[PDB]
Design a protein around this motif. Structure first.
Motif, short mmCIF file in Angstrom:
data_model
loop_
_atom_site.label_atom_id
_atom_site.label_comp_id
_atom_site.label_asym_id
_atom_site.label_seq_id
_atom_site.Cartn_x
_atom_site.Cartn_y
_atom_site.Cartn_z
N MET A 297 0.86 -1.22 0.00
CA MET A 297 0.00 0.00 0.00
C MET A 297 0.88 1.25 0.00
O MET A 297 2.04 1.17 0.44
CB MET A 297 -0.92 0.05 1.22
N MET B 48 -0.25 5.11 1.24
CA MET B 48 -1.28 6.02 1.81
C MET B 48 -1.06 7.43 1.23
O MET B 48 0.10 7.87 1.20
CB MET B 48 -1.17 6.09 3.33
N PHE C 38 -9.02 1.15 3.52
CA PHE C 38 -9.58 -0.23 3.43
C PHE C 38 -11.10 -0.17 3.65
O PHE C 38 -11.73 -1.22 3.86
CB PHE C 38 -8.85 -1.17 4.39
N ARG D 92 -13.46 6.42 2.76
CA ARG D 92 -12.82 7.52 3.54
C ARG D 92 -13.25 8.86 2.94
O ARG D 92 -13.86 8.88 1.87
CB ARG D 92 -11.30 7.35 3.52
N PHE E 139 4.07 1.17 2.66
CA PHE E 139 4.22 0.13 3.71
C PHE E 139 3.71 -1.22 3.20
O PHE E 139 2.70 -1.26 2.47
CB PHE E 139 3.48 0.55 4.98
N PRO F 175 1.11 -7.42 6.28
CA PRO F 175 1.67 -8.55 7.01
C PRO F 175 1.34 -9.90 6.35
O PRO F 175 0.51 -9.92 5.46
CB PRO F 175 1.02 -8.43 8.40
N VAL G 94 -3.41 -10.75 7.74
CA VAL G 94 -3.91 -9.37 8.01
C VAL G 94 -4.20 -9.19 9.51
O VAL G 94 -4.00 -8.06 10.01
CB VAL G 94 -5.15 -9.05 7.15
N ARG H 242 0.08 6.26 18.51
CA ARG H 242 -0.66 7.08 17.51
C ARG H 242 -2.12 6.64 17.48
O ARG H 242 -2.42 5.47 17.69
CB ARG H 242 -0.01 6.91 16.13
N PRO H 243 -3.08 7.57 17.24
CA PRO H 243 -4.48 7.20 17.09
C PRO H 243 -4.78 6.57 15.72
O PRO H 243 -4.28 7.07 14.73
CB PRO H 243 -5.21 8.54 17.25
N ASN H 244 -5.56 5.49 15.71
CA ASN H 244 -6.10 4.84 14.48
C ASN H 244 -7.49 5.43 14.21
O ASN H 244 -8.49 4.68 14.29
CB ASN H 244 -6.12 3.32 14.60
N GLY H 245 -7.54 6.73 13.92
CA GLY H 245 -8.79 7.50 13.71
C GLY H 245 -8.52 8.80 12.98
O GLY H 245 -7.33 9.14 12.80
N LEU H 246 -9.58 9.51 12.59
CA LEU H 246 -9.51 10.80 11.85
C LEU H 246 -9.67 11.96 12.83
O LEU H 246 -10.44 11.82 13.79
CB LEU H 246 -10.62 10.83 10.78
N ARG I 191 -15.44 10.69 11.47
CA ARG I 191 -15.40 9.24 11.80
C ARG I 191 -15.44 9.08 13.33
O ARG I 191 -14.38 9.22 13.97
CB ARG I 191 -14.15 8.58 11.21
N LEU J 136 -2.94 2.98 18.49
CA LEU J 136 -1.91 1.98 18.09
C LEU J 136 -0.56 2.40 18.67
O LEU J 136 -0.39 3.59 19.00
CB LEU J 136 -1.85 1.91 16.56
C1 LIG Z 1 0.45 -2.58 10.93
O1 LIG Z 1 -0.73 -2.27 10.24
C2 LIG Z 1 -0.56 -1.38 9.15
C3 LIG Z 1 -0.94 -2.03 7.84
C4 LIG Z 1 -1.83 -3.01 7.77
O2 LIG Z 1 -2.17 -3.61 6.54
C5 LIG Z 1 -3.52 -3.40 6.09
C6 LIG Z 1 -3.81 -4.16 4.82
O3 LIG Z 1 -4.38 -3.99 7.09
C7 LIG Z 1 -4.95 -2.92 7.75
C8 LIG Z 1 -5.67 -3.04 8.95
C9 LIG Z 1 -5.88 -4.36 9.58
C10 LIG Z 1 -6.17 -1.88 9.51
O4 LIG Z 1 -6.88 -1.94 10.67
C11 LIG Z 1 -5.99 -0.58 8.92
C12 LIG Z 1 -6.52 0.59 9.53
O5 LIG Z 1 -7.23 0.53 10.69
C13 LIG Z 1 -6.34 1.83 8.93
C14 LIG Z 1 -5.57 1.89 7.71
C15 LIG Z 1 -5.29 3.12 6.98
O6 LIG Z 1 -4.58 4.00 7.43
C16 LIG Z 1 -5.04 0.77 7.10
O7 LIG Z 1 -4.35 0.88 5.96
C17 LIG Z 1 -5.24 -0.52 7.71
C18 LIG Z 1 -4.75 -1.69 7.16
C19 LIG Z 1 -3.96 -1.93 5.96
O8 LIG Z 1 -3.69 -1.20 5.05
N1 LIG Z 1 -6.85 3.00 9.57
C20 LIG Z 1 -7.72 3.90 8.85
O9 LIG Z 1 -8.04 3.66 7.69
C21 LIG Z 1 -8.22 5.09 9.60
C22 LIG Z 1 -9.66 5.24 9.86
C23 LIG Z 1 -7.36 6.03 10.09
C24 LIG Z 1 -5.91 6.01 9.92
C25 LIG Z 1 -5.05 6.44 10.83
C26 LIG Z 1 -3.56 6.42 10.58
C27 LIG Z 1 -3.14 7.00 9.22
C28 LIG Z 1 -3.01 4.97 10.68
O10 LIG Z 1 -3.33 4.38 11.91
C29 LIG Z 1 -1.44 4.95 10.53
C30 LIG Z 1 -0.77 5.92 11.49
C31 LIG Z 1 -0.84 3.50 10.75
O11 LIG Z 1 -1.18 3.00 12.01
C32 LIG Z 1 -1.37 2.47 9.70
C33 LIG Z 1 -1.29 3.00 8.28
C34 LIG Z 1 -0.60 1.12 9.84
O12 LIG Z 1 0.60 1.18 9.04
C35 LIG Z 1 1.82 1.36 9.65
C36 LIG Z 1 2.87 2.03 8.83
O13 LIG Z 1 2.02 0.98 10.80
C37 LIG Z 1 -1.46 -0.09 9.37
C38 LIG Z 1 -2.58 -0.36 10.39
#
Ligand SMILES: CO[C@H]1/C=C/O[C@@]2(C)Oc3c(C)c(O)c4c(O)c(c(C=O)c(O)c4c3C2=O)NC(=O)/C(C)=C\C=C\[C@H](C)[C@H](O)[C@@H](C)[C@@H](O)[C@@H](C)[C@H](OC(C)=O)[C@@H]1C
Ligand SMILES: CCCCCCCCCCCCO[C@@H]1O[C@H](CO)[C@@H](O[C@H]2O[C@H](CO)[C@@H](O)[C@H](O)[C@H]2O)[C@H](O)[C@H]1O
Ligand SMILES: CCCCCCCCCC(=O)OC[C@H](CO)OC(=O)CCCCCCCCC
Ligand SMILES: CCCCCCCCCC[N+](C)(C)[O-]
Lengths: 154, 1034, 48
Positions: B573, B575, B617, B620, B666, B669, B672, B717-721, B815, B828
């Motif tokens: 991927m 981003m 995924f 968005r 990036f 894995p 997934v 880091r937050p996994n959110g917008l 979101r 995360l």
């Molecule tokens: C280890 O994990 C990685 C890849 C999994 O490979 C994949 C195939 O499997 C995924 C899974 C199981 C998810 O849960 C994802 C996810 O929750 C995302 C995004 C989209 O980025 C993803 O892209 C995935 C994603 C994959 O591509 N978050 C979102 O869309 C939302 C709503 C917000 C995003 C927040 C930021 C921007 C994001 O947190 C960022 C800071 C990083 O943490 C991630 C991009 C991680 O990259 C890294 C480099 O560490 C991935 C979770």
């Protein structure tokens, strides 16, 4: 570059980064897509120290967004008493009208901010100021059923 | 039992045949897949609310559904997203072993009774309840090269003339369309509507009345007038079938007689249901199908079948339409099997060469060449019986087991060849005596190896499921190998091996084989002399042993942890993230630069760039994009510089230059649902109805405190917008009621024009499709356009929106996340270099206990499972050691001697750790299963030396040192034979650079290194252990 | 009710049938759409 970093920092409330950005010469008139300056954001999110730091670094106190709202609107509306005072001190237009004709008094009255309404009134807010619907801060207070606010505006 | 089948070699052959047929039968019928079901059963409720904000979705859909998810069995946790793309997705993750069908039916049943509480708009769209899965068999891309078709045009063709035929294909489970079929798009003009005193309310009312299926009745229906001749169905109004018909929809007749049609106030075309997601393939408009493998299906067959069906569709494709394969697991799975069949054939070829090198007769080399394939085939039958599948884990399970299977064959034949050579006994009586010496040990070995591997199956969660694949595979292979070594191998030895003269050690022969025999016999005397010297100065070697145990313990900590190695899969991927308020166009400009970079700078590596604007995924905002880069085959890009690792780093670095956007590449894995081993998954929870903003502040506070511990926490880091500018518009009720404008007509005119409105269905070429009314783009772009929209008052006067509305800018979430019904924010992060995942979590919990009142926390995903699967690890390690000890105690009839065997464990682990550390690999699953097979084989060697040593002392009344020296002499040849073959057998896996070589390296490296030390050290240390242990305890 | 076989098949039978993918042990699936408005979709599964 630094302008977009200040917008984020001013909103996040990172006083240290803002200080560093004020030293590096970050643009204090930088605006987002909607026309919100770092002061706008700082006034909205209630970051007092950054509002003070921005104003003494030549930030426009009467900057307006694309809908005519000034930082005083955002501060008076979201109940940030200290910022309303600091803005009014630094020459914030107390009778500033957005495109709807809504004033900081209207917004302060709307959310029932007693202290802020008195501050705006101390700094000479037009109590008889009407919006596009011909409604005063009193008309708002009566409709909201705020007995104290209604008493203050009489 | 061996005595029985020595006299009955045909019975033995019958069992061998039945096993081979059972195995061959199983191989033909066994399902094939890259990986089996690892992740716990999850169910995703999915809904759409056209033109809805995150808040609107959450407060009308997400919360209502969440509140009704009661009385459902075996639910672990529940999470939901609500975003400004008009989407909600509630994921319910269940206990491992939960029937996913029962899990899904209980969820959709509770939803069905919540449906009447959702908005009409959401009920109309439908709320999907599906089994959660991120694992596709392949992604069939459909593209138009000659620019005759849009993505909406391709998607509609795929929906109509491909999807169903692919859905009906053999072994195909689920099929997702990458896009939507056509919709009748009414593009309203507000200036034209205002001129005729019309509103979107009239357009909707008209479309609903004039595009409908109306039930009439029958001519001569029952009860009839007796004498009726005719009974015919009355066809009244039916749904419209074309843009032309929708155009002619009558809205009003004027005073002067002139007619106002729908085409007079709106552009009318076939379009897409959604315009948020723009998909491209090397810049060209693209749709596609996401295909998943059906339960118990063959991944190789299904893939071939999907290709056979696409081939039959080739002749009917419009000009410019091409099929592409950006993602396909089959190429990987095919190589995975070939490299395993290669390893199991090479192993047998190497055993033949080693067996011949030492024993120097072809009749002897045939016995393992028969015995091993019989055991391997038998294993496949036992995998089928337990309901397992041929997959990466089960296949590499056999590759790790080949050491144990080859040893069983060698050990039995070699001991017969020795007993014949030393006592000049005929093959039959020689085999009886040979088996007499080892039969009890082989049973004991089975029980010991069972006690090593069986407890590995009883781990819980995802990791438990993975360990279980290896566990049951290696236990089954090893168990059959023992049965074969007690039934077949004896029978083959007694009938196929030829007599050897007493004292014929092959020293009388000439040439290479004569040289080797006299060279090896010399080397055997040197070994026994060396062990003689070692057994004189034991105290020193006990000190050199404790150094190895410290060196082991040291390397074990230093070696980084992982679940599976990050392999080059031929996809990764990239981003694309623009600032808050950024538009679809602005994001496309950056995607075009990302696409341009890969197709020019990585021309020799990159095959295709699948750029999806307004997508990660999941749907968005416009400010988000993502590029799925499909690489050329590993063979067309040699070295380490042309792997994802390097390409990723190079691309991520190159995209640092890009301004007004945040682009980073990036890898994905191995599986997934594992993520990272050091990585944790934290949920910050609003437990006291504090609100979104106060939960944002609490998150910022936790993110800040986490940054003040770089020594313990990394990338917290937050996994959110983040919140974004949104346009708050206030309808003044008083001005509306005073002007005679109904609030319903106002909120309909706004929603329909600006957000779009799903009116009803129509039939386009025999397919039912949606009718959408919406403003033509140019009249719903900026706040200035709001006043151009007019609503008709009760007195028929047209009032502009500007007259009864006021607007301001505010900030809100695009979101909104929830966890177990309550508002949440996913965080995360991972343990800092040299720290355990458990330590990082403990600090995250500590930092969380110092957050504002009402702000709670919880662990989810890998973190939830790591806590549960980590709790039971000690118990299994313990049960393993206790049962191994007890089994050896029964074998040797002593509480003391077992230690002589059990002391071997570190001798194998040290080399594995050194090899893995030097090579620069990780403490992964393949490595850990590799350690157990190294420990098991080194334990087997030791068991046989100690059994021989003790039996000499017990029966022939020999002395400790005499018996020990005589034992290690007899056991040297078989130990060196097994080791030489098995080390060479896994040599290709260590050097392997090509496809799926990450797993091969992880397997071989920690096995080769482990075997080199285990072999070298055991032959010198096992005699020490036996002598020291037998001394301390009289 | 009121729909002919063609209308019923396009808007019901196919809409249902196209979703009857990814079901375990499905031998064959037969269906009919009537001018009485009736749909009947029978899925027959493997023995056992
Ligand atoms: C280890 O994990 C990685 C890849 C999994 O490979 C994949 C195939 O499997 C995924 C899974 C199981 C998810 O849960 C994802 C996810 O929750 C995302 C995004 C989209 O980025 C993803 O892209 C995935 C994603 C994959 O591509 N978050 C979102 O869309 C939302 C709503 C917000 C995003 C927040 C930021 C921007 C994001 O947190 C960022 C800071 C990083 O943490 C991630 C991009 C991680 O990259 C890294 C480099 O560490 C991935 C979770
Ligand atoms: C890089 C890792 C590879 C490891 C493998 C290295 C091979 C050597 C393995 C260790 C065995 C060393 O070899 C063996 O050592 C012992 C002593 O320890 C020697 O024994 C010598 O010392 C002892 C004690 O002082 C005397 O009782 C004995 O009379 C004397 O000969 C043997 O003569 C020698 O053959
Ligand atoms: C001869 C007796 C040996 C017994 C040891 C077996 C222990 C394994 C227990 C079990 O089932 O767990 C499997 C587990 C799953 O990850 O695999 C492993 O992680 C195995 C690790 C090897 C043991 C290292 C010993 C070092 C200290 C002395
Ligand atoms: C449950 C523990 C089992 C240990 C194995 C015991 C083997 C002893 C065999 C005895 N023998 C067959 C030679 O008579």
């Amino acid at each position: 570059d630094l302008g977009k970093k200040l917008l984020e920092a001013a909103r996040a409330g990172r006083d240290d980064e803002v200080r560093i950005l004020m030293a590096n010469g970050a643009d204090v008139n930088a605006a987002d897509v909607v026309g919100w300056t770092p002061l706008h954001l700082a006034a909205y999110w209630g970051h007092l120290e950054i509002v003070e730091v921005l104003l003494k670094n030549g930030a426009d106190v009467n900057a307006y967004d694309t809908l005519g709202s000034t930082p005083l609107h955002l501060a008076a509306h979201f109940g940030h008493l200290e910022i309303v005072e600091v803005l009014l001190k630094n020459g914030a237009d107390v009778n500033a009208k957005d495109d709807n004709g809504i004033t900081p008094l209207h917004l302060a009255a709307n959310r029932g901010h007693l202290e802020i309404v008195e501050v705006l009134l101390k700094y000479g807010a037009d109590v008889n100021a009407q919006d596009k619907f011909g409604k005063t801060a009193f008309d708002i207070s009566i409709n909201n059923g705020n007995e104290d606010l209604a008493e203050i505006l009489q | 039992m061996p005595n029985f089948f020595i006299d009955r070699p045909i019975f033995a052959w019958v069992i061998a045949i039945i096993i081979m047929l059972a195995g061959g039968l199983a191989i033909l019928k066994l399902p094939v897949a890259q990986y089996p079901t690892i992740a716990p059963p999850a169910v995703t409720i999915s809904a759409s609310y056209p033109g809805a904000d995150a808040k609107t979705v959450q407060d009308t859909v997400t919360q209502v559904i969440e509140q009704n998810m009661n009385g459902i069995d075996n639910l672990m946790y529940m999470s939901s997203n609500s975003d400004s793309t008009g989407t909600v997705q509630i994921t319910l993750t269940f206990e491992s072993g939960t029937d996913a069908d029962i899990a899904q039916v209980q969820v959709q049943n509770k939803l069905q009774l919540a449906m009447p509480l959702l908005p009409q708009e959401v009920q109309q769209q439908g709320v999907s309840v599906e089994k959660s899965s991120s694992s596709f068999l392949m992604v069939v891309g459909v593209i138009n090269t000659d620019g005759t078709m849009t993505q909406e045009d391709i998607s509609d063709y795929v929906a109509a003339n491909m999807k169903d035929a692919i859905s009906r294909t053999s072994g195909v489970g689920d099929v997702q369309l990458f896009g939507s079929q056509y919709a009748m798009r009414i593009w309203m003009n507000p200036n034209e509507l205002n001129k005729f005193q019309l509103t979107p309310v009239d357009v909707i009312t008209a479309i609903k009345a004039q595009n409908a299926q109306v039930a009439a009745g029958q001519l001569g229906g029952t009860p009839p007038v007796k004498g009726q001749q005719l009974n015919a169905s009355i066809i009244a109004q039916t749904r419209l079938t074309s843009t032309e018909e929708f155009g002619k929809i009558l809205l009003k007749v004027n005073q002067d007689g002139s007619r106002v049609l729908l085409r007079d106030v709106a552009k009318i075309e076939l379009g897409g249901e959604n315009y948020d997601i723009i998909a491209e393939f090397n810049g060209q408009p693209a749709s596609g199908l996401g295909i998943k493998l059906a339960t118990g299906a063959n991944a190789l067959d299904t893939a071939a079948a999907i290709r056979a069906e696409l081939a039959k569709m080739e002749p009917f494709f419009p000009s410019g339409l091409k099929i592409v394969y950006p993602y396909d697991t089959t190429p990987f799975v095919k190589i995975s099997i070939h490299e395993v069949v290669k390893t199991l054939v090479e192993a047998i070829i190497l055993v033949f060469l080693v067996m011949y090198l030492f024993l120097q007769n072809f009749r002897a080399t045939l016995i393992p060449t028969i015995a091993v394939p019989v055991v391997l085939l038998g294993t496949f039958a036992v995998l089928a019986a337990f309901g397992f599948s041929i997959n990466t884990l089960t296949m590499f399970g056999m590759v790790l087991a080949i050491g144990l299977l080859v040893d069983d064959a060698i050990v039995v034949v070699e001991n017969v060849e020795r007993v014949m050579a030393e006592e000049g006994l005929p093959p039959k009586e020689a085999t009886r005596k040979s088996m007499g010496q080892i039969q009890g040990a082989l049973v004991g070995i089975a029980m010991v190896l069972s006690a090593v591997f069986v407890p590995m199956a009883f781990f819980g969660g995802s990791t438990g499921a993975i360990y279980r694949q290896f566990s049951i595979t290696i236990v089954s292979a090893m168990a059959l190998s023992v049965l074969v070594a007690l039934i077949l191998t004896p029978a083959l030895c007694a009938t196929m091996l030829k007599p050897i003269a007493k004292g014929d050690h092959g020293e009388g022969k000439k040439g290479f084989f004569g040289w080797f025999n006299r060279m090896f016999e010399k080397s055997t005397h040197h070994y026994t002399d060396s062990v003689g010297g070692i057994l004189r100065s034991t105290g020193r070697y006990l000190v050199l042993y404790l150094i190895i145990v410290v060196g082991m313990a040291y390397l074990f900590v230093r070696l980084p942890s992982s679940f599976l190695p990050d392999e080059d899969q031929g996809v990764f991927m990239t981003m694309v993230q623009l600032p808050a308020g950024a538009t679809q166009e602005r994001t496309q400009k950056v995607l075009n630069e990302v696409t341009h970079y890969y197709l020019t700078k990585e021309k020799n590596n990159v095959e295709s760039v699948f750029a999806v604007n307004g997508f990660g995924f999941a749907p968005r905002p416009q400010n988000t994009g993502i590029a799925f880069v499909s690489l050329k085959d590993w063979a067309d890009r040699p070295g380490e510089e042309n792997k994802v690792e390097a390409i990723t780093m190079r691309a991520t670095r190159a995209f640092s230059q890009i301004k007004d956007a945040m682009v980073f590449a990036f890898n994905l894995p191995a599986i997934v649902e594992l993520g990272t081993a050091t990585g944790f998954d934290f949920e910050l929870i609003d437990q006291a109805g504090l609100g979104h903003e106060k939960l944002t502040q609490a998150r910022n506070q936790l993110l800040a405190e986490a940054a003040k511990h770089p020594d313990m926490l990394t990338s917290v880091r937050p996994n959110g917008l983040e919140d974004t500018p949104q346009f708050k518009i206030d309808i003044d009720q008083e001005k509306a009621q005073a002007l005679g404008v109904s609030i319903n007509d106002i909120n309909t005119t706004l929603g329909a024009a600006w957000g779009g409105s799903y009116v009803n269905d129509f039939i386009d070429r025999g397919r039912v499709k949606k009718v959408y009314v919406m403003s033509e783009a140019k009249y719903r772009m900026l706040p200035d356009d709001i006043g151009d929209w007019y609503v008709r008052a009760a007195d028929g006067q047209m009032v502009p929106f500007s007259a009864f509305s006021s607007s301001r800018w505010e900030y809100g979430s695009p979101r909104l996340e929830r966890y177990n019904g309550l508002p949440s924010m996913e965080i995360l992060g991972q343990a800092a270099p040299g720290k355990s995942t458990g330590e990082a979590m403990e600090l995250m919990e500590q930092l969380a206990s110092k957050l504002p009142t009402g702000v709670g926390y919880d662990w989810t995903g890998m973190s939830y499972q790591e806590r549960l699967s980590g709790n039971q690890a000690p118990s299994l390690y313990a049960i393993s050691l206790i049962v191994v000890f007890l089994c050896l105690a029964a074998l040797y009839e002593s509480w003391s001697i077992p230690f002589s065997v059990m002391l071997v464990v570190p001798l194998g682990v040290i080399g594995a750790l050194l090899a893995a550390t030097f090579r620069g690999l990780t403490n992964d699953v393949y490595f850990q299963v590799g350690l157990l097979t190294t420990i098991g084989l080194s334990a087997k060697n030791a068991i046989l030396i100690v059994e021989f040593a003790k039996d000499l002392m017990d029966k022939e009344g020999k002395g400790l040192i005499e018996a020990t020296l005589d034992a290690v002499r007899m056991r040297l040849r078989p130990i060196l034979m097994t080791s030489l073959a098995f080390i060479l057998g896994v040599m290709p896996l260590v050097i392997s650079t090509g496809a799926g070589s990450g797993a091969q390296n992880a397997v071989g490296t920690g096995v080769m290194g482990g075997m080199v030390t285990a072999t070298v050290l055991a032959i010198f240390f096992v005699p020490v252990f036996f002598v020291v242990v037998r001394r301390r305890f009289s």
